[PDB]
Design a protein around this ligand. Structure first.
Ligand SMILES: *[C@@H]1O[C@H](CO)[C@@H](O[C@@H]2O[C@H](CO)[C@@H](O)[C@H](O)[C@H]2NC(C)=O)[C@H](O)[C@H]1NC(C)=O
Ligand SMILES: *[C@@H]1O[C@H](CO)[C@@H](O[C@@H]2O[C@H](CO)[C@@H](O)[C@H](O)[C@H]2NC(C)=O)[C@H](O)[C@H]1NC(C)=O
Ligand SMILES: *[C@@H]1O[C@H](CO)[C@@H](O[C@@H]2O[C@H](CO)[C@@H](O)[C@H](O)[C@H]2NC(C)=O)[C@H](O)[C@H]1NC(C)=O
Ligand SMILES: *[C@@H]1O[C@H](CO)[C@@H](O[C@@H]2O[C@H](CO)[C@@H](O)[C@H](O)[C@H]2NC(C)=O)[C@H](O)[C@H]1NC(C)=O
Ligand SMILES: *[C@@H]1O[C@H](CO)[C@@H](O[C@@H]2O[C@H](CO)[C@@H](O)[C@H](O)[C@H]2NC(C)=O)[C@H](O)[C@H]1NC(C)=O
Ligand SMILES: *[C@@H]1O[C@H](CO)[C@@H](O[C@@H]2O[C@H](CO)[C@@H](O)[C@H](O)[C@H]2NC(C)=O)[C@H](O)[C@H]1NC(C)=O
Ligand code: NAG
Ligand code: NAG
Lengths: 49, 463, 463
């Protein structure tokens, strides 16, 4: 990368900056409302029609 | 509660008026009292050194940017190269300065140095008490390096707000200073030990190695104070000097302008970094300042147009930033050149120039480390209680007109002292105090019409 | 295969320590050896002068863009005027510098000048071999003006690579230097003719017209070397001097920083021109960098949408270019002031200030032409083999307390030499060279408690 930045096969000696590590990503974490529940409980009591 | 503000005229301090003379004699104004005093200066010698990742500042590595960015890759090379050259110059300026700061030889530094002088500048064998007062007054953020990054990482306080750990997001790099602070302290301890011999020639390569107090008295004869006065007042002089020195412990206030300049230098560096940080949130009319947001909200044909708009404004900020750094780096270099000159004049030796150093003739001055620069202190001499006396251009033998003399570093005055039977007396230019005229205080000169015709008694020449 | 890089501490040289002593006598450090040596500096004085054509840079005779350009014709007018003013400033600095370079009078110069001193700087009557070495070491492109235009034209080699032929494409104009290198050579020879000398008072009226070697001995006594030493070592001095001068043949290397600065002055000028050239190919989102090409490919109602984009970006580049030139021009003017100051101090006279000139006290310095500036060489005096000796603040007659003397530009040291029967001896301050105390090297002073009480043999006063 250093050679490409100077368009040359002979960069002068020195200390040079290079791009940083982008780190590493982990598995996702998500929070959203829950507890929908579909009101199906009437089927469990009384005599069915 | 407060009343109304008061309009007021700016005062004009009139100079003491000294009526001229229209004969062979003239009024002379001479102080009869004096005090030591101090003035201070701050000279910046560096700009904090930074570099910027030219891919990371623009984007967070999202691939669409990485593809688009290739069109602009050459701009980044120009950015990195320019910053790099600026940083190299800062390092050369430091090395150049220190080459003149060092002395070939010095006294060892010991406690109790300077005799009766207080010398709070002595090292706590370390930096110095005064330098630490300055650094504690400074509001600058804690450094990184070691432990560095693990003070940024989740195992640390939730309250960190340092731009220093923001460095690991923005792609900033804050370069370490070229020199370890301990070596810097060593360079100025060497300057402390370079005092004496101050007189006896230029001092280029001899080292007198004499007590600090003795070098002071030599300097006092260098400004026209007679030796007789100095021997009588030695303890008095040390006491006045220490009072002036003691005031340095109260000198670190916001009313001290040199101190204020240090504070501004600290926030010049902070300001530049904060500007780049604020720009990360600056949408350019792009749907969001975030790349991930525009990716998640846009069909890719649209997405790339928005990304390009975002990139263009980001690159423009980086270009302006480089220009800003180049200007500041250059001004720092010039300031460093000034510092170099003062060390080789105002510090290493007494100077007759005026202007430079404290505004009270010149006696020894000191320098200490300060953030981004050097902090100077100058001890000065301040005249007081001026009186007017009769004085003559010179004296001659009335019986032998070719015998003419004139005072050296002082003036002939009509005597007003009861111990001197001689009608005339000699005093030093810096302080009123009559003395008998002797060959040590005079030199032979060609005769002149304004010289007094003495018909009675002159010892130099006796005849 | 080469070894791994090695981590290392940065060395800190320690000054020679000199222990402080109490009482009426003190330790003194004095060199017993010395060498001549040199340092060099490059002071740029000018920016290469150029002008541009806001009519040839933007577009090239296409009638459609000419009409479009007319709406912006005033920008070019601002550009041209700004560049013109910058060039006037460059010529002002040249004349101002030369006004101090010139002398009302000088010695003629012939081969073999300086006697035993080698003086390679003498012209091959010419410029000088040293100036030519510099020009050969410089990597700068082949010169303008003649034959000029015909090196763009097919009447020359296909291997030419000069941006100067691109001068006739880009609309660049490179203005000629005002000074004319032959007049420049005359001015530097005139400065050599002012040598021998500055000594003998002010030197601001009279011209001493003495041999070069004599002016050197005068300077050596001006730094506290005794006259006796100078007479004994005359050939030795010339030998050491020419060793330092001979080292200049190795001075043209990349580790010589003054040399490096000269090369970068050249590099900066070349880069500025290359920037404008590269921009000729820079589309601004325009279909092509060529105006004629987009005209050929497009119906005129759409054609000038493309032309407009192209024109605006080209103007923007020119504006940035001008701003840069103004900044550089100002830095050159300030740098030129520094050059003028050193000519009127570091060159025209020996200086007591340290600081300026090479760091070895000061002795004569020289200046030669360098591209875009002046190149200075400073001869200096470097001490070696320092020894510690016993010394006294002064001497007095124990039989008469008012008889007190002190050394002039030297010290009283306990004798360590078998030739001198006297318990004390005078020495030069620049070199260890003890000698008998005589009235020529001493002065009467007021008495002091630290002066030694000599109860026997003192020749000054005999009684
Ligand atoms: C004149 O010299 C005296 C020293 O005798 C200076 O000192 C002052 O002395 C008075 C006497 O009581 C004190 O009240 C002051 O506090 C002293 N001043 C200090 C310590 O700064 C006096 O300052 C000199 N005069 C002037 C005008 O400076
Ligand atoms: C010289 O100044 C030093 C400054 O450090 C003086 O030491 C201080 O004296 C005060 C007097 O109350 C104490 O409160 C401080 O704690 C002392 N500081 C230190 C670091 O010890 C010292 O007394 C002065 N000496 C003379 C002779 O003037
Ligand atoms: C006393 O008077 C002056 C000094 O106060 C001496 O100088 C001469 O003064 C006269 C004026 O009357 C001038 O014309 C002369 O030119 C002065 N002398 C010189 C050498 O310039 C004067 O000589 C003294 N002695 C007398 C008058 O005997
Ligand atoms: C003063 O020191 C210099 C160098 O330190 C001495 O020069 C000698 O020079 C030759 C020629 O390069 C070297 O080969 C020798 O090694 C040098 N000698 C030493 C001891 O370094 C010079 O002779 C010394 N002069 C004295 C002691 O009077
Ligand atoms: C001193 O001046 C002499 C000339 O008087 C120089 O000697 C010449 O140097 C050049 C450069 O290499 C040679 O081409 C010549 O052949 C030399 N002349 C002779 C007669 O041999 C010499 O270089 C100068 N410098 C020193 C340090 O002696
Ligand atoms: C002999 O040397 C001493 C010191 O080495 C001279 O200084 C005297 O020192 C004492 C002690 O402080 C003072 O009380 C005297 O006043 C000093 N003398 C003077 C003249 O100030 C002493 O003068 C020397 N004796 C001579 C030169 O005859
Ligand atoms: C100076 O002396 C008196 C001062 O009152 C004045 O009248 C006179 O004109 C001045 N000049 C000369 C030459 O005396
Ligand atoms: C050393 O210098 C001190 C300085 O206060 C002085 O008091 C003392 O007399 C001197 N001599 C000795 C032997 O301590």
């Amino acid at each position: 990368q250093l050679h490409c930045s100077y368009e040359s096969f002979d960069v002068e000696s020195g200390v040079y900056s290079v791009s940083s590590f982008e780190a590493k990503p982990s598995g996702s974490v998500v929070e959203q409302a829950e507890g929908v529940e579909c009101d199906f409980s009437p089927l469990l009591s009384g005599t069915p029609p | 509660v407060p009343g109304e503000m008061r309009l007021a005229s700016i005062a004009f301090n009139h100079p003491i008026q000294v009526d001229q003379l229209n004969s062979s004699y003239f009024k002379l104004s001479i102080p009869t009292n004096f005090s030591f005093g101090v003035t201070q200066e701050y000279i910046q010698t560096t700009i904090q050194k930074v570099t910027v990742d030219c891919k990371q500042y623009v984007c967070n590595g999202f691939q669409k940017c990485e593809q688009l960015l290739r069109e602009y890759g050459q701009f980044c090379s120009k950015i990195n190269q320019a910053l790099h050259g600026a940083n190299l110059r800062q390092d050369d300026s430091v090395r150049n300065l220190f080459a003149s700061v060092k002395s070939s030889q010095s006294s060892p530094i010991i406690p109790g140095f300077g005799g009766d002088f207080n010398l709070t500048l002595l090292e706590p064998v370390a930096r110095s008490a005064i330098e630490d007062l300055l650094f504690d007054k400074v509001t600058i953020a804690d450094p990184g390096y070691m432990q560095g990054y693990d003070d940024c990482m989740q195992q640390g306080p939730a309250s960190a707000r340092d731009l220093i750990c923001a460095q690991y997001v923005a792609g900033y790099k804050v370069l370490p200073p070229l020199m370890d602070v301990n070596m810097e302290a060593a360079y100025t301890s060497s300057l402390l030990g370079s005092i004496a011999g101050v007189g006896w020639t230029a001092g280029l390569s001899s080292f007198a190695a004499i007590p600090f107090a003795q070098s002071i008295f030599y300097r006092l004869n260098g400004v026209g104070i007679t030796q007789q006065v100095l021997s009588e007042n030695q303890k008095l002089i040390a006491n006045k000097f220490n009072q002036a020195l003691g005031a340095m412990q109260t000198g670190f206030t916001t009313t001290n302008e040199a101190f204020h300049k240090v504070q501004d230098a600290v926030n010049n560096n902070a300001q530049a970094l904060s500007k780049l940080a604020s720009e990360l949130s600056n949408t350019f009319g792009a749907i969001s300042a975030s790349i991930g947001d525009i990716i998640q909200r846009l069909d890719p044909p649209e997405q790339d147009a928005q990304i390009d708009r975002l990139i263009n404004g980001r690159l423009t900020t980086l270009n302006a930033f480089v220009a800003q750094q180049l200007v500041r780096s250059e001004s720092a270099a010039l300031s460093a050149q000034l510092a170099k000159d003062k060390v080789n004049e105002c510090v290493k030796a007494q100077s007759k120039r005026s202007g430079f150093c404290g505004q009270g003739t010149h006696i020894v001055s000191f320098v200490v480390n300060a953030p981004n620069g050097l902090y100077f202190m100058h001890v000065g001499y301040y005249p007081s209680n001026h009186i007017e006396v009769v004085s003559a251009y010179g004296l001659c033998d009335a019986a032998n007109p070719t015998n003419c003399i004139a005072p050296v570093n002082g003036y002939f005055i009509k005597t007003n002292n009861t111990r001197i039977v001689d009608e005339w007396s000699y005093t030093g230019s810096s302080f009123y105090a009559p003395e008998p005229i002797t060959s040590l205080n005079t030199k032979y000169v060609a005769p002149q019409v304004t010289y007094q015709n003495i018909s009675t008694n002159l010892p130099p020449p006796l005849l």
